[PDB]
Structure formats: structure tokens, C-alpha cells
């Protein structure tokens, strides 16, 4: 027997007794696709009106609401809207008194529909809207939702039962050692290479492509705190599913209100009136507590807290060298139950050929080796339907009944609004 | 020395130099047991009423409220009801007219108490509500809370230093290979077993008694974000602890309002009165938004999330051949919790004659020399404690809590009050 | 070949054929420090009051509103308050009429500014509040927030690809073992030594002079160690709180006979009810709030059960497998650090190894490779600060770094606080 240990950096290599280089280093693992993850953007707009509108609205504010940011909020993700009448109509109009502005403005809404909250607000400071003949007439608009940046959105795959692959070149013949596979032939012998432990779970985090990498799952309560994987979760890149804020919590709040001295919670928009330079007309001022205390900036979160490459342990490998040395029919009627890239291994059954042991593989991922004859199995599948099924020889077509990742997240789960009945008697 | 591949599948074996058999898979572990399980599910009723009635209770409102869900959504978990005046008696009655119906109805509620919020809701349609002979009197009543169903309640033990155990037969001797004991004693010299790393932590889902499995935390940001383990988390299958949903939020919408275009979000309820086909007397439309966006249907998530199994790599295994104090332990006392995750101090006094591999309820906890001997141990058996150093048992004594026990342990569980004293 | 089992204990030893002793049994990791960790802990004050106040803050309240509570109530994260006008002046006073508490209570706020909610509740049971020579005045206010308790606070370092180190002498030559290293050179020989496999992640309690306690574990918040302050308040630089937070406590007042009383309030629920006088013009305030996570953690109780005076390692033996197989150049130069440390993202390490044979390069004692001759590039999970003392096993030389603190990554990537935009006129 023969001992050496071999560096894992590149340009490391043995000579004595037979030499392996370090080719490289990569890993195999079992994948887990989340599907799209974003952080949870509190986005907020509004107007501050001399005038009391009858269509609370993207549209029927289009005189005072700006366009873009009112229809991209209206289309986030849990949005609230107010309407403050602060001085409503003297006399006239239609509905527009200060007397269809009762608590959550029933009246006012019965003849102005409208999705968004109403409310009265007089005793509020009118001091915005000037230039009035007789009495001032001002309102407040406030809109708040979470809307997905598609620059902030990341796809990201959790990598499970990780395994470092350490790319060797035994005397120039390629030998792929990992913890699950450490043995390599040499011209006249064996070698069993001794490799550190596998580094755990890893996070893969896909811009679009480009691939980032994080160590773990990731843990949300250390410095990883923000990432996208702690924030919004759609499976489907469509759909949203699991943890989800509050709906934000709209205040109308006076320039000279205490409240401004100090800082709106998460999830909290809160609306300033600002005076207008022109007669008739007014701002407004938006402060808003961004979820989770801190608005996150993608590129600059991904270059700090993740790597371009899977990490792995400094080494060195063990080279123990050793005097020692150790059907191909494809299988018949197998069949694929399950999903892949899901995390939940899939049911591999069929027939093992004659004339030995039949090492399967689906489309070219080992899933162990069987005697001939039925055989059973549940392997992690990392590849999508149709099956190529082989034992080391000719392919054959299985059938299959796999689902996606995205189909494995809504399997189980019935999507969207409980709806009942309730009959008179 | 002999070197072969042995696979890992029913049937395996090799017959070169010593036969060996694969027997079986089964698995070790340190179970963290976390008590019961369940989604969380949002359930809502109530009815449209053309009365303005005077008991705002499943009992006082049985005219109206279908009764079976009434009394199980008020024995739910963060109940949340109201009741809406939409038109009140003009005149007569008894704290029925509009002036009771102040915002929070407290002028109502000083003669008709009720655990429920009372709101005005004028200037909302009263359409639905006709057939009066003068003006028209309506009301409506929402309910929601979290309801526990016994049929999706999962117990589930979380399995910690899992350690794969390949049962092998080496030339009919039983030798149980694992990454910690990786050897067999054969006469013609030692078998050293080459093994896959272990799979990491597995779930146990237990219903009620048959387990199925998951891989891994789980994973709550990934395809099995719906487990029950996610979600409502009862130690003791009795009492809640942890991260809960707030209480429903309860809306009266109008069955034109633009709102009804948009979904409601987690946990908001909103109520539609129907238009009666009946005179006074109408129906009610309901729309919740389930916590997490969908409603969890457990054998279904069962079915598809788990396996019969738990998972182990692939192999093969690498079979290397190679030609390379009996008397119980004294004073033993066992201090912590069992199946909790945090190790329990086991303490005592190793006799003489070598080293004493000790045991705990047939628990390997490792070999002490003779003497005073202290462990921090992770155990999964409950007391009383059988101690053995391989042979003849004794009893220890021990101070041992159970899992549900240890969730409790280092809190002061309910309400907290306080009183302010007048100066 | 020779074969042995070594026990794991204090004292455990082989004499044949090589003398082995362990020595002690320690840890290796990559630490992740995540800062200051607290429970949630709603905290609630207030008073009944036979007045209506014009100044609704501590010091304004002073003459009914416990000072000690009030003062580190309102200094609490999430704070909450409510002045309630149960019965109002009916004539005279100053902006204290009944018309003054408008719902949300702007009328009163013109003249008497507060940052606390001001809401009518005229129709609330006024009872409490006796002894006037006309009309009773009454008002109740309620103050909750969440309020770290500094005995309550612990700093958690997350300990990952954890090593257990199995200290040997080995014929008195000291020797480490870990799944990473398992080699010893015995005197004409090699000891290969199997070890079982390591515990996985720790959980590093440290409180207070300062001591550490040891969790086993991510940890996991669903199951027994679910009240953890890892699983609960989130201050990465011990200052600042980031990620998930409970909502604003929900204030409510609740009558005496309200069948509400008959059920416990929500988390984060507060609930207040006036109690009669037993003195004119007097009366006291019974408060009812349902904590965090439905309980109260009481932290040395819960660090006594829930963690152990060491870390956790499986119970062995070690296989000492004996074989026959037989038994420093120049600092590497130009060496830069960049990334974080203590941090859980690897950072950049690049230099130049000298001539001679490969660098077994040391940043600050850690081990993070061995290198050929010239150019290389690294990513090291590092355990120590700035600056960076770089080696081959020989002379040490200063790198250069640019190299953050785990708080300071914690804040990279994210703008903290309030997020402002202006809506200007069209
Ligand atoms: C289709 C269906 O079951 N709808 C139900 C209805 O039948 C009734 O039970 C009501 C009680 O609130 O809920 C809803
Ligand atoms: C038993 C106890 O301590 N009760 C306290 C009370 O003494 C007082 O401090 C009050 C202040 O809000 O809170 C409650
Ligand atoms: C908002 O959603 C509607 C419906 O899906 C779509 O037609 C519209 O273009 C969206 N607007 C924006 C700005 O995203
Ligand atoms: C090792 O991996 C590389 C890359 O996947 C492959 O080309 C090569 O054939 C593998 N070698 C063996 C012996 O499997
Ligand atoms: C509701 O709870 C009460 C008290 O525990 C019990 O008597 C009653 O049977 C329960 N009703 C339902 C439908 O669960
Ligand atoms: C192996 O495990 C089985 C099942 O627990 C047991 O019956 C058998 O005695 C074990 N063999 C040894 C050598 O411990
Ligand atoms: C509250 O905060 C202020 C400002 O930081 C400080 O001066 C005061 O001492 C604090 N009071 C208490 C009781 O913590
Ligand atoms: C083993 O560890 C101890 C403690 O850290 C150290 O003093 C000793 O030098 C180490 N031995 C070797 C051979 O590295
Ligand atoms: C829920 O309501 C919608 C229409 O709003 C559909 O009728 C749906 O079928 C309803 N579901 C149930 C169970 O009644
Ligand atoms: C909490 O209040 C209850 C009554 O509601 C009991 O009196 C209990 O003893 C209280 N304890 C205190 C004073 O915190
Ligand atoms: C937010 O408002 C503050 C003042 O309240 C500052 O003006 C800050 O610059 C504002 N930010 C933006 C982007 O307008
Ligand atoms: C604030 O938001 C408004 C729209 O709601 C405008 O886009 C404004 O320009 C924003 N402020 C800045 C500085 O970007
Ligand atoms: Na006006
Ligand atoms: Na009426
Ligand atoms: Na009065």
C-alpha cells in the first residue's frame, strides 16, 4: 500500500506511485426547483385633490393620480386605497356634501362606486387647496400595494443531498470521485480516495442566465435575512402561495401631526398634503415603511451575498493506493410515478433483464443497481419526462405519469377563494 | 485484502470471497417529537336577515344562521364576528332603531350584549330585504375562525442524525452497517463497509396508525410550502404556540361593488347579501381568502408530498476484506427530556473490570472507563431508565420530561394582565 | 494491518500496537454571527381617568399613567396607544366637549396634539368614574408596544459545516481527527481513523462575565425549541430590527360585563377594562393581552432546558485502523481579501504562491487550501476579522483586505428605513 495527499486547487497533482491530477471540481445533488422568488416591495402612490371626484379609479383620478405608477400598483399583490374627503361640497353637486362622507362612506359610494376604502376627514388641515371663491373643497387619494419588480424577481433551485464531485485524471484515465463513489481503477490496482464531508444544502439563485450561489437553506433569521427566499414565494412564476403581508395600512397624517416624528411600521403608508404653488391645486407627501425594515436592491444583494461557484472544502484528498481489484439488455415495462425536481422521490418499478444486475439508469441518472426480475425504487428524479431507461446498453421508452415542480406545489392544495352559500329558510 | 460492489436492492448479494446479502434498509435517528400538525383553515358563515335581532349569538340568530356551522366556526381558533345594521326599525322596537347603531354599536350592546362586533352598515343596499308593509328592516351577520379538522390534524417527529442501517448477512452472521459503525467481524479478517453519506434530516407524518415520509426540514419555501408542519403547531395536540394568522377580517360588500372584481386576500371574508325569492327573507354569498392562497386537501398532500419509505441513496456499498467491564453501571441519574432535541445528562458510576459500553433503555450512549462517568445524550426512549454496561440491567433514577412537556418548559403560557391602581 | 476501538470518554485509551489516548474532544465550524436575538414581548400600560386630558403623552398623563411602565412602553418597537372619550365635558374646558371627538378625534388634535389615536366611546359604560357635581367626566387610555427586556437579549453565532475534533496523542504526538483530516503518523507507520459523521449545524447561545450555551440545530421553530429568540425579535448590529414583525398591537376597550371577557384575546391583542373607584373622581384599569406566540418566555428558564454547557457529538467509538504505509516556504505575496467574515458567504481570496512546492496557505491561523506556484484564487468561509496575516506554513506577510463585519453584511444589499416619494402637482 501507498499513501499521498493531493491538493484540490487547479494545477494540483500527484506523480508517486502511479499520477492523478486535479481535472476540476463540480457536484451532483437532487434539486428542488421553488420556482420564482421576490422580495416584498411596498409601493405607494396618490393625489392630493381640490375637488371631490365621483370615480375613485386609475382613470377617474387621471387629473391629478400619476398614470404609470397608479396602474402598476392597482395590478400588486394585496392592495389597499383610501379616499379622505377633508372638506367636501357647501351645497349642490351630486353626493358630494359632507354628509355622504359617513363612516366608510356608504353614501357617497352607493351613488360613486368605487374598490377603494372611503372615509370622512374633516378636521383635517385644508390648507393645501387655496384659491376658492366661498368655502375650500379638498380630497386625498392614497394607494398602496406589493408589486413585483421583474428586476428584483429570481428563479431558485434548492440543491439537496449535495455531493462534491472531484474531477481526477488516475495516470490519464478520468475518475469522478464523491462520497457516494470514492474508488478508482490505477493500471495495476485500486485506488480509494479519502474526501472531506459534502458541504449540506445549497441555494441557486438564476437571473435572467446566470447562476449565484448560496450555502444552506438559506437561514433567514442571520445576514441572508433579505433574501428573495425569505420573501415572496410563487411556484408557477404566476401564482402566489404561503406567507403574505397584511394589506398596507393607509393614514392621511398633517404636516404638523407628532406622528411625523417618528418612523411609519412595516407595511405602513402614510400621506402628507403638500401646498400648492398654483390655486386650486396640491401634493403630497408618501412615507412608507418598507416590509421586513429595509427595501432590498437586487444586484447589490446578490453580489455580496451569494458566489459565482458551489463552495467546497479546502481539502487536501487522501490517495490510499492499493494491489486490490474489484445485464446490459434495457429493462422491460418500466413505469415513472411522481414529480421531479421536487424534492419528493418518484416510484421507478419494471423488469430487470437476464444476465446479471441491471445498473438503471433514467435518462442517464443512476437510481441503483437490480437483480433481474421486478423490481421497485424511489429515486430522485432531476429530469423531466419522456424516460430514457437503460442498463448500461441499448435505451428503452418508459411510461410515465411525472409532473413539474410548479404542478407538485399546487398538488394537494385547492387555489384561490372559498366560496359559500348561505339559503334563506 | 478483496474488494466488491454489493448493491442496495432486494435480492443483492456476492459470493466472492465471504457471500454477503443485503437482509434490509432501515434507518437510526434522534427524534424531535413536535406534537400535532394542521393547516390553517379559514371558515366563514352567517346570514342576511330582514330583522334587526336582539341576541347576536349561534342561539339568538338560529332562525337565520345555519346551526352545525354556526357552533363549530364559534369554537374555532382567532374568531372574528359581525353584525351590520343595513336598515333599522324607524320606530318602536327595543334599542332597535338607528341611533343604537352607533360605530361599535355600544348603545345597542348595553341591552343586547354580544361577543360580536356591532357596526352601522346605512347607506349599503337594503334591495335584497322586501315585502314590508311600510319601511324595510335588515341586518347581516358574518363568522369566521380558524376550525382544527381532526381528519387533517398530522402528528409528525422530525428525525435528526439519521443514520442509514444497511442489514447485512455475512455468511449468514447479522452485521448492521452504518457511517458510525461501519464494520463486520469475519473469521477469515475484518469487512470494512464503504457507505453513502446519510440522507440529512427526514419528517415523519403520522396519521391515525400508518407513517409516511419527507426529506429533509421540510422546506417551506419550496413545492411542499403546504405541509401542516408550516402551519398550525400544537405541542401537546391541545394548545397553540408559535406564529398564528390575525383574526378574519369581516366585510359587508354590496353585490355591485368593483370590489368583487379583485380576490380577497388571507383571511378576509367578504359577505353578499342574495336578493330573497321569498318575501322578507334573503340569502348570503361568501368569499374567503384561504390563509397561504390555497385550502390544503390532506390525503391528496399526503399522497403526493411523501413516501411509504424513508429515502436512502442509491449505493452500491464498497465491501473492503481485509485479513486484520460486564457488571451494571452504578448510581445512574438521567436528567432533561426525551425526543426533544436537546441532550439529557446521564450520570453515574462505570464498574470495574474494563469499559463500560454503556446503554440506556438499550440506547448505545457510548463506553465510559471505570469511575465516574458524564454524557450529554440524545435519547428517544421515555422513563423509567434500564441501564447496562452489556450485561445484567439496573434502575436509574430520573428527572425526564416528555416532548410536549419540554414545548412548554421555559414559558408562561395565556393571557398576561395587569391592573393600574387609582393614585 | 492492526485493528482497534476507541471509546470517546475522558481517560479512553489503546495501548496496542501504537499507545492512543483521547486527549479531549472539541469543535470546528464556519460561523455565522447573527447578531442580537430577543422574544417578542408585548408589553401594556394605561388609566382610567375621571378627566379628559389636553395632553395625552407620559408626561401629560403623569398624574394617573404609572411613569416607569409608560416611559419604556412608548420607547417599545411597534407602539400602539389610544385615548377613548367615554364621557365628555358638557360645557366649558378647552376642546374637551362630546363634538371634539370626531371618529379618529381631529376636532380635539387641533388644539391638544398627541401621537397616540384618539376615538370616541360614548356609549361605554361611565360607571367607574363617580363623585361630580353634575355630569360624570370620564376617559381611558391604553398604551402596548413591544419592548426588549436586555435580560432577554442573547447574541446567536450559527455554527455551520460543523467538525467534531477528536484530540489524540498518538505515542505522544498530538494529532486532530476530523472526517476532513483523519490521519496520524504513528512512530514507523500511518493511523487512519474512522469517525462517525458530523452533528450537522449549532446553535451558539452566548449571554452575559459571558458565557456560551448549545443548541443542536438550525434551530427548528416548528417543533419543542419553537420559543427560541432565534425564532422570534432580529437585531443583526444589536441596534436595528430587521425582517418579520408583529403588527401594531390591536387596543381595545372592553366593559366590565362584555361577553367578549368570556373569551382570551388575540396575540397582540390588548384589552382594557375600567374598574369602579373606591374614591371619588378615581378609578383603576384592568388590562388583559394575549402575548407573542400565545406565551411569555422566560429566558433563563428556557436556556437551562433548552441547551446543554457543550456542543453535542455522536457517542463513537473512533476505528483506529494501523498501517505499515510509511509516515514551510515563503509567504505567498500581493494576497487581497475581499467579502465579509462570520458571515456565511466565502470570501475572495487571491494572491501569488511562491516557487518551491505548493502554499499551504493560512489566513490568520485558518487553513484554506494548499496551492501551486503563482497565481490563485480561493472563496473561504473566514472565522476572523481584518487584517489578514497570510502564510505558506513559514514567514508571514500582511494581505490587503476589503472585508466587512457580519452586521454590516446583514445591511448590504437592503436601504434601511422609511421610504419617502413626492406627488407634485400636475
Ligand atoms: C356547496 C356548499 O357546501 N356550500 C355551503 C352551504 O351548503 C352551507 O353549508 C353554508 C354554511 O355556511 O356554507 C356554504
Ligand atoms: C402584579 C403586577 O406587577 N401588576 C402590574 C402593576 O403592579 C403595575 O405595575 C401595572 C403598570 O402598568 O402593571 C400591572
Ligand atoms: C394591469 O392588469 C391588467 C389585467 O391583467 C392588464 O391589462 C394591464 O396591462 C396591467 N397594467 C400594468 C401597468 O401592469
Ligand atoms: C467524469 O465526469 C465528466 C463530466 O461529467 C465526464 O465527461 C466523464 O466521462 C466522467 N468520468 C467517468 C469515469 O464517469
Ligand atoms: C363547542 O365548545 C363547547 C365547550 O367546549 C362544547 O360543549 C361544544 O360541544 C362545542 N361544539 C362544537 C360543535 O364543537
Ligand atoms: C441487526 O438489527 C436487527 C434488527 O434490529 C437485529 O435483530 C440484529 O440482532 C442486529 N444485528 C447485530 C449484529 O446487532
Ligand atoms: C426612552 O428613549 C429616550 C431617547 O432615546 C431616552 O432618553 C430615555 O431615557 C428612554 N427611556 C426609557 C425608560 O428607556
Ligand atoms: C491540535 O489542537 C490543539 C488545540 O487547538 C493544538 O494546540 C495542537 O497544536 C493541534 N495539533 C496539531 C497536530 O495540529
Ligand atoms: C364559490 O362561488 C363561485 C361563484 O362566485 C362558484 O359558484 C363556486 O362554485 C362556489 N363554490 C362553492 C363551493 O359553492
Ligand atoms: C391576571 O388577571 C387575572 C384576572 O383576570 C388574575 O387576577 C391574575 O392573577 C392576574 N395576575 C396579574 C396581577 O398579573
Ligand atoms: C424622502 O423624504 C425625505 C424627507 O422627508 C427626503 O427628502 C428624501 O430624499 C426623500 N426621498 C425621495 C426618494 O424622494
Ligand atoms: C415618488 O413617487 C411619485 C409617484 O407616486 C413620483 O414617481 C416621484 O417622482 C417619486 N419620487 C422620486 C424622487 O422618484
Ligand atoms: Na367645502
Ligand atoms: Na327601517
Ligand atoms: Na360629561
Known sequence: EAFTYLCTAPGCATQTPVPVRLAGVRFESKIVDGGCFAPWDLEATGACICEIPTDVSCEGLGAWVPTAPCARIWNGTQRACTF????????????????????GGSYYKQYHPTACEVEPAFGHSDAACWGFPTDTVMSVFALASYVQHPHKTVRVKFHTETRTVWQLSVAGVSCNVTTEHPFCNTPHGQLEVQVPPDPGDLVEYIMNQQSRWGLGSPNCHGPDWASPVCQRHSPDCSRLVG?????????????????????????????????????????????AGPYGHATVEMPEWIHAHTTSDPWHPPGPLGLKFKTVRPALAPPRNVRVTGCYQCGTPALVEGLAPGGGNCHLTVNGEDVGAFPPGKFVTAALLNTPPPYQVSCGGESDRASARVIDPAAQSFTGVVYGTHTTAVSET
Do not use: M
Not at 379622505?84 to 362622507?101: C, E, I, K, P
Open 243 to 287: 406567507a403574505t403581508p397584511e394589506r398596507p395600512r393607509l393614514r392621511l397624517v398633517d404636516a404638523d401631526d407628532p406622528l411625523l416624528r417618528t418612523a411609519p411600521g412595516p407595511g405602513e403608508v402614510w400621506v402628507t398634503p403638500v401646498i400648492g404653488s398654483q390655486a386650486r391645486k396640491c401634493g403630497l407627501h408618501i412615507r
Open 84 to 103: 379622505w374627503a377633508v372638506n367636501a361640497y357647501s351645497s349642490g353637486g351630486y353626493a358630494q356634501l359632507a354628509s355622504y362622507f359617513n363612516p
